[PDB]
Amino acid sequence: GSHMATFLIKHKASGKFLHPKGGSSNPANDTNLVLHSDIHERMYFQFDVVDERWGYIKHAASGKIVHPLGGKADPPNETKLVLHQDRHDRALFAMDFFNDNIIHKAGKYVHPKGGSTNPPNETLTVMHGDKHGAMEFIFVSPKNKDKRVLVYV
Amino acid sequence: HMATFLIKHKASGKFLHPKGGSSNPANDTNLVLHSDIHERMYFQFDVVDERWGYIKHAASGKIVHPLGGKADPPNETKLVLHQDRHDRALFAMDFFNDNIIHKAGKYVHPKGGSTNPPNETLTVMHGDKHGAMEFIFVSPKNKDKRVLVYV
């Protein structure tokens, strides 16, 4: 809904964060989502709850949301994650704050491309069905990157 | 308009109730499993700290406690309703793994661990994880529709 938490999406193994590539306040449609160590307001996210666990991962600065590129119902492994303005069911994710992962409605997870525990800055993110330590994410305060915050509001 | 929901034992389809089904259960009333549905078995969840909060009997405002209110209760500790609020009554509603976890790490179980507990079976804390300790949180008007308990 319109009341949302504002948080950082932190890759647990590396300590890096989800960013729009380039860090714009208003990324173009289909801008890749990457991992990067910087912290600033143009990498803050919100979670827009739609249907129980399901909702949109919203870029706070622009209002664009996370999508598997191309808007397929069941994206294959290695489908890149991007930002896009469209709001529809194929952009639904759940923020699993118990198992520490981000799961798409068709069942794959958000990963760093290549699956490293310690990826470099600018590493792309993709959908992949595998579960392992390098696909874990926690959701933390913009003012304290170690403090978990509740994203279901 | 806080979330109001049924706590459904996944394996059996029975629900969490105050023993006796009252709108006004006394302090230390046991929490049981039972198949009946009514407004006196609706629950709410009051968030305290991120994942942690109080599981609340909607009709009375009583919350779930380990009997005796200890921080780190042993296996088989009965679960009861009580009006007091304190940090030993904190639980998280894990709607991903489908369980209810206390702050010290044990889970809500049917006493005995059955996949098909009879009506009136007591609930307890126990550290084990298995299919008969799974619970889902559903709409009073549609017991198959999961609802978000955090809002």
Residue numbers in the entry:
A (entry chain B): -3 to 149
B (entry chain A): -1 to 149
The authors write:
MytiLec, a lectin isolated from the Mediterranean mussel Mytilus galloprovincialis, was identified through a study of marine organisms and their adaptation to different habitats and environmental systems, and shown to bind α-D-galactose and N-acetyl-α-D-galactosamine (α-GalNAc). The structure is well ordered, with the entire main-chain of each monomer visible in the 2mFo-DFc electron density map, revealing a β-trefoil fold consisting of three related sub-domains. MytiLec is somewhat unusual in binding ligand at each subdomain, and it forms a dimer in solution, giving a total of six ligand sites per protein.
Apo-MytiLec crystallised in space-group P21, and diffracted to 1.1 Å resolution. The lack of an obvious search model led us to determine phases using a heavy atom derivative, which was aided by the strong diffraction of the physically robust crystals. Two monomers of MytiLec are found in the asymmetric unit, and the model shows expected geometrical features and has no Ramachandran outliers. Several N-terminal residues remaining from the thrombin-cleavable tag are also present in the apo-MytiLec electron density map, so that chain numbering of the apo structure starts at -1 or -3. Least-squares fitting the Cα atoms of residues 1 to 149 of each chain in the apo-MytiLec model gives a rmsd of 0.27 Å. Overlaying 37 central Cα atoms of individual sub-domains from within the same chain gives rmsd values no higher than 0.6 Å, indicating a high degree of internal symmetry. The two monomers in the asymmetric unit are closely associated by hydrophobic interactions and hydrogen bonds, as shown in Supplementary Tables S1 and S2. PISA18 reports the buried interface area between MytiLec monomers to be about 740 Å2 per chain. Two adjacent phenylalanine residues, Phe 93 and Phe 94, sit opposite their symmetry mates at the dimer interface. MytiLec was originally reported to be a monomer in solution on the basis of gel filtration but analytical ultracentrifugation confirms the protein is a tightly-bound dimer, and mutation of Phe 93 and Phe 94 blocks dimerisation. In order to observe any changes in the protein on ligand binding, both the apo and GalNAc complex structures were determined. Both the apo crystal and the co-crystal with ligand were cryo-protected immediately prior to flash-cooling by soaking in mother liquor containing 25% glycerol.
